[PDB]
Write a protein that binds this ligand. Structure first.
Ligand SMILES: N[C@@H](CC[C@H](O)[C@@H](N)COS(=O)(=O)O)C(=O)O
Ligand SMILES: N[C@@H](CC[C@H](O)[C@@H](N)COS(=O)(=O)O)C(=O)O
Ligand SMILES: [Mg+2]
Ligand SMILES: [Mg+2]
Ligand SMILES: [Mg+2]
Lengths: 198, 330, 198, 330
């Protein structure tokens, strides 16, 4: 038995993470030596990602591209608490890559003192295969090394979604506790009333 | 006199909570601060309110971080003069009763079960009782009905293999807070959590299964018994009884951690609360697999072993989350 | 930054679980003794629940009420594999209750051989408090005992939702391996593109 | 000559998979059926392709359930005569090479690293090499470049503390299937899973740390060392090297389980696969915390201990899911 549904327009809340940037995963041709996406000092090519501060959509999901500084262009995951506007949410969206594919926990913190551990998988930056049914956010043609631009070696960034099943007001998130995991952008999607089509 | 219980809780936490609230104490802080696992072979009684307290008093062990104490009394004679004298001295008696003889209990003249309620007023003809266990009741019952429940032989009942065969024996519990409570500040919560974790991690004595290693040994011993045997039946009866108030304390400890998470906006306490609630929930899998094996001969040893293993893994994870929570408040 | 999303038209797929009914959680006054919602032989009162085979909505979500027989009116959870129509899904919706609140795993099986363990919490049938931010499905006035109808004791059933984050074709679910957990109805909600509003 | 690798895999599984595919064998079945953890103190070499094989051959241990064998050879002189003879005999030599001297490798004249590739054709002036490691390459390189890589000193390189200081030594691996493969039916997959689980559960007898108990001891030993010391640095270099092909085998075993889950529509194999992948993913947390501590002096003992504890718990959970999978196919 199949019945058509209708869901109201939700709201996207693009989280300003400029204050949490703690790691350089991206370099231009003039600062190849600043790359710390991995232990080997690789990085995404700046030329193959959006301009800092720009509004983008990945599979329709809006993100703000981080206002990078010399010492940070992403969150290398160390269990950072991220304040979010209080509200009822359905989904967390992350633009992310991992130093080899890995899985961990995003905690959602609710007003009533409940916290939910939400499973999150992030696939490899190194010409990765999606292991967690992510969508491709960026698949570059090249990769930056400490001393050269490597032709014909994709650097991969992933769009991952994480459900927030609890009907309650979420106030903050905790990012994973893993040096392997990198978050480039974070967007929340509010709950929207679903019903039968009239 | 305030009705107080939780869906994971029994008349044990409920009646103590009423006594604490009467004296202006927060039952979540007092009864929710302690979190432990102990099982003493042979200690359990077929009573909804069984908790292994030795060497502490029953209320003492359930309120380990507070100067809270209880004494058990067996009332001589055929009346309620001892309870009248207790009330006149400002004590709230907690009476050992059989639900079979309580008109407001679903069990009335149907199921024998050893239970606790609060007595808060006595007249020539009526005993005023407070019982928060669903369905909650507060008010007068006939003296004769109270005496019937308070004096019940609570005989072995095929319809209640867990909480029958424990005479009421006109037993009642007197509770007192014998000094001022500790200020439940960040440093106190940190110390409570560290003391709970240290006690869980401690290698147990030979004669008492305590903490994480004790839980492992207890569940291994339990799963080693052959389903349907008299040995298994006795062990599964014990399991259901002891695990009620151990599960109840798990739920209360999670609530205690959530309350302090909200008070101070410290997310580590909410995260720890989730890990502790996972243990509370893990007890459901173990004790209900046990219950259906015991009562309905639903023998699922692979399921019991699965739930037992999940409960241990959840406890391991909870203790690690609790150490992160202690660090966030200490 | 806050940005509007789009309205969407997801589809509800009401799963026929009549072949998996293995337990009596509901009784009429004539067959009180058949109740097996819990170890005590309690049950939901049939007179306060929908008609077998009937279409209902709970919080706008459509469900088909089980076509009960003498030996089954719900799935008591024993790791049953439930075949679902192949598709891309967002949410599993269950009408459910647990013998004391508990949490476990629904496995989602995908056509590429990936299986995702999905966290599910189900709150108490015994005048329960929602522990997982579920919505109330049914809160009866009475509860059935082996020998009587109990006045003034609510029996509680919950609407619980479980996210299916993987972008992939799901073909089956495994229900929890827990005798404590009862599933009365199962509705799947298909994926529906929601993007930044133009 | 087929390029084959996986994002968790190294040139070890890759080169062996190319050799197996040439002989008409399924590398997911041959290299994915085995799943184990072994660490012998002092056994590891600073090579991308280090795997503890004793007492089996390298290919033997990596294909434990198949009649697959390898022999190491060291070629004397300054030519490729021995490799030409090998090719004429229908062998695909797997040559020990330094990435520093391979023009198609990102490491070319930048980073010394002990690596493997397949040689499939030799002319007077060119060696045709196949290397599936990103970025994948297949074709002729100048004889001089191959000889420079095959004969490389691979001296200690402060840009590569893991895979430098292991001379190529003109070493090459000869692999052969010495009989028909076992038929991979439901019963065989069952036996494979049960033997893997039994080997994981078995306590090691002596200094070689094997299975779940060995992993516990290995990780405890690692976490006990003082960060920044020569001993900790040596241990973290070892950790990163040995864990690559151990993690790679975890990924391949998960793929093997998924493949048979689809083939026979047995969801227990897919569920077990998820459990095994959780171990593969668990290795990432451990080896990358280790790598950043070793290379960038990012000393995070709490993080390393946390990842180590999570990895053990994921392995425990995986073993239970595998036994359920074995029951479903047996
Ligand atoms: N809800 C608890 C306790 C049940 C009681 O023991 C009743 N069987 C008899 O007493 S009654 O008055 O509560 O029905 C459980 O599920 O174990
Ligand atoms: N991707 C692997 C292996 C890295 C290589 O050893 C390179 N550092 C040198 O060789 S290259 O030619 O692949 O760059 C890892 O992350 O450990
Ligand atoms: Mg005391
Ligand atoms: Mg402080
Ligand atoms: Mg062999």
């Amino acid at each position: 038995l199949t019945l058509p549904g209708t869901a109201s327009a939700p709201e996207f809340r693009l989280i300003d993470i400029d204050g949490l940037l703690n790691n350089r995963a991206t370099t231009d041709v003039r600062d190849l030596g600043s790359g710390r996406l991995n232990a080997w000092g690789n990085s995404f090519p700046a030329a193959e990602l959006p301009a800092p501060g720009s509004l983008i959509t990945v599979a329709g999901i809006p993100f703000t591209w981080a206002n990078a500084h010399a010492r940070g262009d992403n969150i290398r995951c160390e269990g950072q608490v991220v304040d979010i506007p209080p509200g009822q949410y359905d989904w967390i969206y992350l633009l992310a890559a991992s130093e080899r594919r890995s899985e961990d926990t995003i905690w959602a913190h609710y007003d009533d003192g409940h916290a939910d551990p939400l499973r999150v998988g992030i696939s490899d930056f190194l010409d990765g295969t999606p292991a967690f049914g992510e969508l491709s956010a960026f698949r570059t043609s090249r990769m930056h090394y400490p001393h050269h631009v490597q032709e014909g070696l994709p650097t991969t960034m992933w769009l991952t979604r994480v459900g927030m099943p609890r009907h309650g007001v979420a106030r903050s998130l905790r990012l994973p506790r893993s040096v392997a995991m990198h978050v480039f952008a974070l967007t929340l999607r509010t709950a929207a009333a679903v019903r039968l089509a009239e | 006199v305030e009705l107080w219980t939780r869906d994971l809780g029994s008349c044990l936490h409920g009646t103590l909570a009423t006594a604490l609230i009467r004296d202006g104490h927060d039952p979540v802080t007092v009864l929710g601060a302690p979190w432990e696992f102990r099982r003493r072979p042979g200690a359990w009684s077929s009573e909804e309110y069984f908790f292994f307290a030795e060497p502490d008093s029953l209320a003492g062990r359930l309120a380990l971080y507070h100067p809270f104490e209880s004494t058990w009394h067996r009332s001589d004679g055929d009346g309620v003069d001892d309870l009248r004298e207790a009330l006149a001295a400002g004590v709230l008696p907690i009476a050992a009763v059989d639900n079979f003889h309580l008109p407001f209990r679903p069990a009335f003249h149907d199921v024998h079960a050893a239970h606790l309620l609060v007595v808060y007023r006595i007249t020539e003809t009526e005993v005023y009782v407070s019982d928060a266990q669903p369905p909650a009741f507060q008010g007068a019952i006939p003296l004769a009905d109270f005496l019937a429940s308070w004096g019940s032989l609570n005989p072995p009942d095929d319809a209640d293999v867990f909480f029958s065969a424990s005479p009421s024996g006109r037993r009642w519990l007197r509770t007192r807070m014998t000094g001022p409570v500790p200020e439940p500040d960040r440093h106190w919560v940190g110390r409570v959590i560290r003391e709970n974790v240290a006690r869980y991690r401690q290698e147990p004595p030979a004669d008492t299964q305590t903490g994480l290693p004790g839980l492992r040994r207890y569940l291994d011993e339990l799963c080693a018994l052959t389903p349907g045997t008299n040995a298994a039946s006795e062990a599964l009866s014990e399991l259901y009884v002891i695990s009620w108030n151990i599960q109840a304390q798990s739920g209360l400890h999670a609530e205690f951690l959530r309350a302090h998470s909200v008070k101070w906006r410290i997310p580590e306490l909410a995260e720890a609360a989730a890990g502790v609630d996972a243990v509370a929930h893990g007890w459901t899998g173990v004790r209900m697999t046990g219950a259906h094996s015991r009562v309905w001969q639903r023998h699922r040893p692979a399921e019991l072993r699965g739930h037992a293993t999940a409960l241990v893994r959840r406890l391991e994870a909870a203790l690690d989350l609790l150490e992160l929570a202690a660090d966030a408040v200490s």
